[PDB]
Amino acid sequence: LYRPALEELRRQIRSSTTSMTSVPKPLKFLRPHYNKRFAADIISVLAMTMSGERECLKYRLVGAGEVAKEWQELDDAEKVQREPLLTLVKEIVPLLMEIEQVDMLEKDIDENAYAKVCLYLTSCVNYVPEPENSALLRCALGVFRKFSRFPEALRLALMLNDMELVEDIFTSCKDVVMLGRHGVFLELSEDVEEYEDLTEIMSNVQLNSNFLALARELDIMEPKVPDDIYKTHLENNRFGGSGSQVDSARMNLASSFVNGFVNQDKLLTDDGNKWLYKNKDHGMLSAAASLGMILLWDVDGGLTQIDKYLYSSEDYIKSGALLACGIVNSGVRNECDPALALLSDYVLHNSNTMRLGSIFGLGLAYNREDVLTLLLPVMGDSKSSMEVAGVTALACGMIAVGSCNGDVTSTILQTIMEKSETELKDTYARWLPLGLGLNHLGKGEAIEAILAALEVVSEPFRSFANTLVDVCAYAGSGNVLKVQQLLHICSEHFDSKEKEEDKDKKEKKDKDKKEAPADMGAHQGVAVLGIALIAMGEEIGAEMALRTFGHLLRYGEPTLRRAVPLALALISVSHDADPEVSYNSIFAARLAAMLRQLAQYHAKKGTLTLCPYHSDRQLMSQVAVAGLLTVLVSFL
């Protein structure tokens, strides 16, 4: 008659000694019925392992309502037991997680939010696949939308890239009124898409125009400049010394970097004249854009300061002056027409270098269609100058970052057809995948890597383009198949897809830095040592990083000796001048001197800071790239 007693005893002994599947059967057939030690045991540990192996065996076996009713019974039972971070992480793998979190998140806010969202967000970006991370983002949009602590929902807007989240957080953060700070990292946290959709719906109404005043290039910089001049006090011995030991027309270029990099004193900026006339053409572009890099504020002052170099007698002065006009601002867009009108020359004219500085600076200022239709004759021109398609591909690529699952439109289809039109000057085939992969950025489930694997596969040039699409196609998820595939294809005979495809290590596992140290330094190929040196990155710079810079610093090739101080001074922003003294003990060529003086001056997933160094990965070329290398935006 009382068969649940015999079934409960049977599952009690089978669960008592050993069993893997026979335990939950008397419970799913028993229909259980009828704060203590016995209940905490048979619920907590017996229902923890019992429902763990039943939800695991049913989650991995079939893919009913019994597992839902028993799983919710464990949900409420552990809501009574109140032991977090164990039963939750055990019940993650069986949406169920949505109704579970919104069913549990009523009282405990900082415990489940801080603990559960902390370890489950780290383990979710580490191990949990993306289709469940989207449920973390939507259900976290729910429970975090109903709860407090808005900035974590702002991170949910950094990962979701949606306009309803920023609108709901603008009316819910606007209904309850610091301000300039959340404007600063509100404009820094938003990407190119949601600030243009945000600025179009809010430029439509915004109901107070105040977040319109904030979400521009006026309130992210109006607190910074006066505070950076007031609260900081930098000496002049660096501009005077580092601006005094320059010579050989290349250390003076390092002094053009001294002038260019700003972040108080503006003496080396206006140290007389002839500093730009004595320099070369590339130094005329760099020194012409330096006055734009020192004036990322005061539009009224920037106009009356850069206007002197506009339409001057020299071509590079006015082209670098238009580049300066593109660097000084990113929301004024009033200097476009005078440069945009004259671009149509198609053979050889000042407006080609003004196309360099104006299309590049406009790309830094920026699904925009009119500038791309104006760039249609630019991509169709195919000038012998590499930097035309350089700043064009980088421009449209930086315009197209963060797109909704990318696109296969006639922009990248046009630059791929015209890319395969003529297989000359492979540098084009190296910097076009820049804009291609930048257009691929922002996808979550795009099959564009397989599409490029179908159409693009050709000779190792467009196979290098294809593996670059594979580089930008693996921003990061639980895809260990790409780790074993990484170890498999890592031994390819081609000596560049190792450098870039293996260079992707700094972007794929950029968050979990414990696994980044590997045996790349123990190899024998100089390119692999470059893969590790680039793999260092720009993080806080622990002692293991400098430990790698101890052996990686002493090298004979000028590409690695020149490449090591850049990451050495980027990963550490009394260890600032001592490694530089070590460089003084190693050196005491021209490139290592210019770069070591560069580090002497600047030594003391955001797309704006992760984009402008893949072009720096191709520095082993002529000084033509150095005219664009000095105007990078990754400097904070």
């Binding site: 011995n237 009394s574 260890h575 001048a577 001592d578």
Partner: protein, 227 residues
């Protein structure tokens, strides 16, 4: 605790090299002698905590005692010359010597220590590396070590036995004084850092920081019976 003036004075003392380069290379001080420390308490952690400021941004070298010399035949100062040549090839470092108690535990110590005295002065080498010497009893050193060796600065560390023990013990009781200011005969930073570190971890263990006199005399009896 309480020895802030001596640790900031020795901080500015040991923080001249490798730091503040605008005047170190323009003035021209470059002292190739270093400082010499000692302490009646000793225990290596007080003097190591006074010279520990060099370990912030530098390469550290530690040679404690002459035990590696007395455990072998009369090789003498050859290993000292090996440390001198590796210190010349490793100039950005700090030569730290601690626990000089060759007699506290005989004619050869005077001659290898006299050769260490002459070679330590830098008769054939200019300013290349800093040498820091440390011992327990200043009365155990020979009077020959006065003019060549001690030329820069010596510290006079007092042993109160009734002031620093009352200060540190007051710090412990802040979270029955004569028993611990009279029973104890040696203290350092590793004691407060040790029992306060394991006291904080234990407070993570049982989720309360209440300290009873009997449990504190039991935890004191563990360290007393341990030695």
């Amino acid at each position: 605790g309480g020895l802030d003036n001596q640790i900031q004075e020795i901080k500015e003392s040991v923080e001249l090299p490798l730091t503040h380069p605008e005047y170190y290379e323009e003035m021209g001080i470059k002292p190739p002698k270093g400082v010499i420390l000692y302490g009646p308490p000793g225990t290596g952690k007080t003097l190591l905590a006074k010279a520990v400021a060099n370990q912030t941004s530098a390469t550290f070298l530690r040679v404690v005692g002459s035990e590696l010399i007395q455990k072998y035949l009369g090789d003498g100062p050859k290993l000292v010359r090996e440390l001198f040549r590796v210190a010349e090839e490793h100039a950005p470092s700090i030569v730290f010597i601690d626990e000089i108690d060759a007699i506290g535990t005989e004619r050869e110590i005077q001659r290898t220590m006299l050769e260490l005295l002459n070679q330590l002065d830098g008769f054939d080498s200019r300013g290349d590396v800093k040498v820091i010497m440390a011992t327990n009893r200043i009365e155990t050193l020979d009077p020959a070590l006065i003019r060549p060796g001690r030329i820069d600065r010596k510290i006079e560390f007092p042993l109160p036995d009734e002031k620093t023990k009352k200060r540190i013990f007051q710090i412990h009781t802040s979270r029955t004084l004569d028993d611990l200011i009279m029973a104890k005969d040696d203290l350092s930073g590793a004691d407060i850092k040790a029992i306060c570190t394991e006291a904080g971890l234990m407070a993570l263990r049982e989720r309360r920081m209440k300290v009873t006199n009997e449990d504190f005399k039991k935890s004191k009896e563990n360290v007393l019976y341990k030695k």
